[PDB]
């Protein structure tokens, strides 16, 4: 829907993902009831990366409609969640450089430099690479 | 007619100073004088109390007394409250003099002897003071026993008794001020608002709006006071239960649109967190989701002339905040969904 340009029905689907990542957990085999994805669709890495995405996906659409409050919320949420995507920190710090640069930005620089792939499934890897921006490191060196 | 003014006002002064502790000068003469004046008033109340211009003249003197004193400054003296209080002035006087510790000992003996002879005048054609005083203690001990052995707060405050009665004291006390037209009910209710405990007060007022008419000019006055002063009405909607405001509204449609206005204004200072699937407020006092669900729950659970109003006031504030048809965006979508 984003490529076909339709804020509404798109942000339907970013919110509808995000609910099935929170008012559900995947990690629920209480019964050996079937055959399952063992690997791909259980990783806590797969989950904290997939959240971090749907929230990144939404935060953009919130800036395409001009609600930097909502976008801020959703980006700040992915950060708190999965600190080692780093495209999360890029989008938030882009948001902060616009509005409220100094203190917030530097506090998160120091956090990134304090911080410093395992089995992510293919559809997501590629999708992260596909959304992610080129001057990402360029922005993080300013 | 003018013969009674000079009598009654000097008696009013005597009554007012009765409970004040300067009682040293007093004697059997003062007590006798008091009680014979009171018998005279009690006979006045009996004889030419009903359907007199004398009736209305006495009330004017009374209510003008109660407004020139105020409930303000020198002393908030009750006094004998109104037209009916002429009938048992005696007893008010009697009760107060006993509380008064400065009462000299000779006066107290002669007093009590005059109040309760005995059964020496068991044959008394008029109900004497003695019998009223028994009756009092009786109802009085009576009311103790009900209260602590079978009274309960009805939840529907409308169908409680204390509230239901305190309302009626308020309605009578504004019916008099309305006839007087000296001060507007506004000023009275402003002073009230400072003076007495607010939670109590509001429930009274709430229930007062509902009591079917007794002479509804009373109810009609309170809505003008409320809609006039916004700040109190904000606390009202906040303090009560839901069904109470529901019935407030269906009775008085002048309250529908501003009440809804206050909910609109509370919903728009929330925010969602994703991790607990719940609307919550920022600030500690910000009426929670719990509470807000409930009141709209109710308002909908109402007669047809309000349900349509409120339901349309939802669809309008929904569209203003994006027509999403999924939760986690529009507080108001949320609600409309939560009503099925």
Reduce the secondary structure of chain B to three states and give it as a string: CHHHHHHHHHHHHHHHHHCCCCCCCCCHHHHHHHHHHHHHHHHHHHHCCCCCHHHHHHHHHHHHHHHHHCCCCCCCCCCCCCHHHHHHHHHHHHHHHHHCCCCCHHHHHHHHHHHCCCCCCCCCCCCCHHHHHHHHHHHHHHHHHHHCCCCCCCCCHHHCCHHHHHHHHHHHHHHHHHHHCCCCHHHHHHHHHHHCCHHHHHHHHHHHCCCCCCCCHHHHHHHHHHHHCHHHHHHHHHHCCHHHHHHHHHHCHHHHHHHHHHHHHHHCCCCEECCCCEECCCCCCCCCHHHHHHHHHHHHCCCHHHHHHHHHHHHHHHHHCCCCCCCCCCHHHHHHHHCC
How far apart are alpha carbons B301 and B295 in whole angstroms?
9
Chain B residues contacting A via beta carbons under 8 Å = 271, 274-275, 277, 322-329
Asked if A80 is an interface residue toward chain B (Cβ–Cβ < 8 A), one would say no
How far apart are alpha carbons B276 and B262 in whole angstroms?
26
β-bridge partners, B272: B279
How far apart are alpha carbons B318 and A122 in whole angstroms?
39
- Yes or no: say if A52 and A78 are a contact pair by the CB < 8 Å rule: yes
- Yes or no: say if B281 and B270 are a contact pair by the CB < 8 Å rule: yes
Q: CB distance A12–B327 less than 8 Å? A: no
How far apart are alpha carbons B33 and B55 in whole angstroms?
24
Asked if A19 is an interface residue toward chain B (Cβ–Cβ < 8 A), one would say yes
User: Which positions ≥6 away from B287 have C-beta within 8 Å?
Assistant: B238, B266, B281
CA-based Rg of chain B, rounded to a whole angstrom?
A: 27
- Yes or no: say if B56 and B83 are a contact pair by the CB < 8 Å rule: no
- Yes or no: say if B222 and B208 are a contact pair by the CB < 8 Å rule: yes
Work out the angle between the directed axes of helices B256-267 and B230-239 (0-180°, nearest 10): 70
Asked if A22 is an interface residue toward chain B (Cβ–Cβ < 8 A), one would say yes
Distances (CA, A) of B246 to A79, A138, B250, B306: 45, 60, 6, 9
Q: CB distance B329–A23 less than 8 Å? A: no
How far apart are alpha carbons A49 and A44 in whole angstroms?
8
Element (H, E) at A136: helix A136-140
- The data reach a resolution, in angstroms, of 4.2
- Yes or no: say if B304 and B310 are a contact pair by the CB < 8 Å rule: no
Asked if A102 is an interface residue toward chain B (Cβ–Cβ < 8 A), one would say no
Neighbour count for residue A87 (Cβ, 10 Å): 18
Distances (CA, A) of B32 to B27, B29, B37, B69: 9, 5, 9, 28
Q: Which residue has the tokens 């600190």?
A: A83
Q: Which residues of B2-38 are buried (b: 16+ CB within 10 A; e: fewer)?
A: eebeeebeebbeebbebbeeebeebeeebbeebbebb
Nearest CA in chain B to A25: B275
How far apart are alpha carbons B224 and B217 in whole angstroms?
11
Pick from B274, B322, B325: CB nearest A18: B274
How far apart are alpha carbons B135 and B46 in whole angstroms?
19
Contacts of A19 in chain B (CB under 8 A): 274, 277, 326-328
User: Which positions ≥6 away from B26 have C-beta within 8 Å?
Assistant: B103, B104, B107
- Yes or no: say if B8 and B61 are a contact pair by the CB < 8 Å rule: yes
Which bin fits B142, alpha (ψ -120 to 50), beta or left (φ > 0)? alpha
**HSE (side-chain half, CA atoms, 13 Å) at B98:** 10
Contacts of A18 in chain B (CB under 8 A): 274, 328
Strand, helix or coil for residue A39: coil
Neighbour count for residue B269 (Cβ, 10 Å): 12
User: Which positions ≥6 away from A76 have C-beta within 8 Å?
Assistant: A92
Q: CB distance B324–A23 less than 8 Å? A: no
Q: Is B56 exposed, middle or buried (0-12, 13-18, 19+ CB in 10 A)?
A: exposed
CA-based Rg of chain A, rounded to a whole angstrom?
A: 16
How far apart are alpha carbons B217 and B203 in whole angstroms?
19
CA distance A130 to chain B (A): 26
User: Which positions ≥6 away from B130 have C-beta within 8 Å?
Assistant: B115, B116, B117, B124
- Yes or no: say if B255 and B309 are a contact pair by the CB < 8 Å rule: no
Work out the angle between the directed axes of helices B198-208 and B185-195 (0-180°, nearest 10): 140
Asked if A11 is an interface residue toward chain B (Cβ–Cβ < 8 A), one would say yes
Asked if A23 is an interface residue toward chain B (Cβ–Cβ < 8 A), one would say yes
β-bridge partners, B278: B273
Q: Which residue has the tokens 């989701």?
A: B289
How far apart are alpha carbons B133 and B94 in whole angstroms?
9
Pick from A12, A16, A77: CB nearest B274: A77
Token digits of residue B75: 């002393």
CA distance B141 to chain A (A): 60
How far apart are alpha carbons B107 and B113 in whole angstroms?
10
Asked if A16 is an interface residue toward chain B (Cβ–Cβ < 8 A), one would say yes
Nearest CA in chain B to A10: B324
Q: Which residue has the tokens 């906040």?
A: B238
The gap from C-alpha B43 to its chain's centroid, in whole angstroms, comes to 30
CA distance A21 to chain B (A): 9
Contacts of B321 in chain A (CB under 8 A): none
Pick from B322, B324, B328: CB nearest A19: B328
- Yes or no: say if B119 and B78 are a contact pair by the CB < 8 Å rule: no
How far apart are alpha carbons B222 and B33 in whole angstroms?
43
Contacts of A77 in chain B (CB under 8 A): 274
Q: CB distance B325–A18 less than 8 Å? A: no
Contacts of A11 in chain B (CB under 8 A): 324, 329
How far apart are alpha carbons B75 and B73 in whole angstroms?
6
DSSP label at residue A135: S
Q: CB distance A23–B277 less than 8 Å? A: yes
Closest CA to A61 of B305, B165, B324, B155: B324
């Amino acid at each position: 829907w984003v490529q076909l340009g339709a804020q509404k029905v798109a942000i339907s689907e970013f919110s509808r993902c995000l609910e099935l990542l929170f008012r559900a957990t995947p990690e629920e085999k209480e019964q050996g009831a079937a055959f399952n994805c063992e690997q791909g669709c259980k990783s806590d890495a797969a989950l904290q990366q997939l959240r971090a995405a749907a929230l990144i996906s939404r935060g953009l659409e919130w800036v395409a409609s001009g609600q930097d409050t909502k976008a801020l919320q959703d980006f700040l949420l992915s950060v708190q969640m999965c600190p080692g995507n780093r495209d999360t920190y890029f989008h938030l710090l882009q948001t902060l450089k616009r509005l409220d640069r100094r203190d917030e930005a530097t506090a998160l620089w120091w956090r990134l430099e304090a911080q410093t792939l395992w089995s992510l499934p293919l559809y997501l890897e590629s999708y992260l690479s596909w959304i992610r921006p080129s001057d990402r490191d360029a922005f993080l060196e300013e | 007619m003018e013969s009674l003014l000079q009598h009654l006002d000097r008696f009013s002064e005597l009554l007012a100073v009765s409970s004040t502790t300067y009682v040293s000068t007093w004697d059997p003469a003062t007590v006798r004088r008091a009680l014979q004046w009171a018998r005279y008033l009690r006979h006045i109340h009996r004889r030419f109390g009903r359907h007199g211009p004398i009736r209305t003249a006495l009330e004017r003197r009374l209510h003008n007394q109660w407004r020139q004193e105020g409930g303000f400054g020198r002393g908030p003296v009750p006094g004998l409250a109104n037209f009916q209080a002429l009938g048992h002035c005696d007893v008010l006087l009697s009760l107060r003099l006993l509380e008064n510790r400065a009462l000299g000992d000779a006066a107290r003996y002669h007093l009590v002897q005059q109040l309760f002879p005995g059964p020496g005048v068991r044959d008394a054609d008029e109900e004497t003071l003695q019998e009223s005083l028994a009756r009092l203690a009786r109802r009085r001990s009576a009311v103790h026993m009900l209260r602590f052995n079978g009274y309960r707060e009805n939840p529907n405050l409308q169908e409680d008794s204390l509230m239901k009665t305190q309302a009626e004291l308020l309605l009578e006390r504004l019916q008099e001020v309305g006839k007087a037209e000296a001060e507007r009910p506004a000023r009275f209710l402003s002073s009230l608002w400072e003076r007495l405990p607010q939670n109590n007060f509001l429930k009274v007022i709430a229930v007062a709006l509902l009591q079917p008419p007794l002479s509804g000019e009373g109810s009609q006055v309170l809505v003008h006071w409320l809609l006039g002063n916004s700040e109190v009405f904000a606390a009202f909607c906040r303090a009560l239960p839901a069904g109470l405001l529901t019935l407030v509204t269906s009775r008085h449609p002048a309250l529908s649109p501003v009440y809804l206005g206050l909910l609109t204004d509370w919903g728009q200072r929330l925010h969602y967190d994703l991790q607990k699937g719940i609307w919550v407020g920022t600030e500690s006092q910000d009426v929670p989701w719990e509470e807000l669900h409930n009141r709209f729950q109710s308002l909908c659970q109402a007669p047809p002339p309000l349900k349509d109003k409120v339901l349309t006031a939802l669809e309008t504030c929904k569209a203003q905040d994006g027509d999403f048809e999924v939760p986690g965006l529009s507080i108001w979508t949320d609600l409309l969904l939560a009503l099925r």
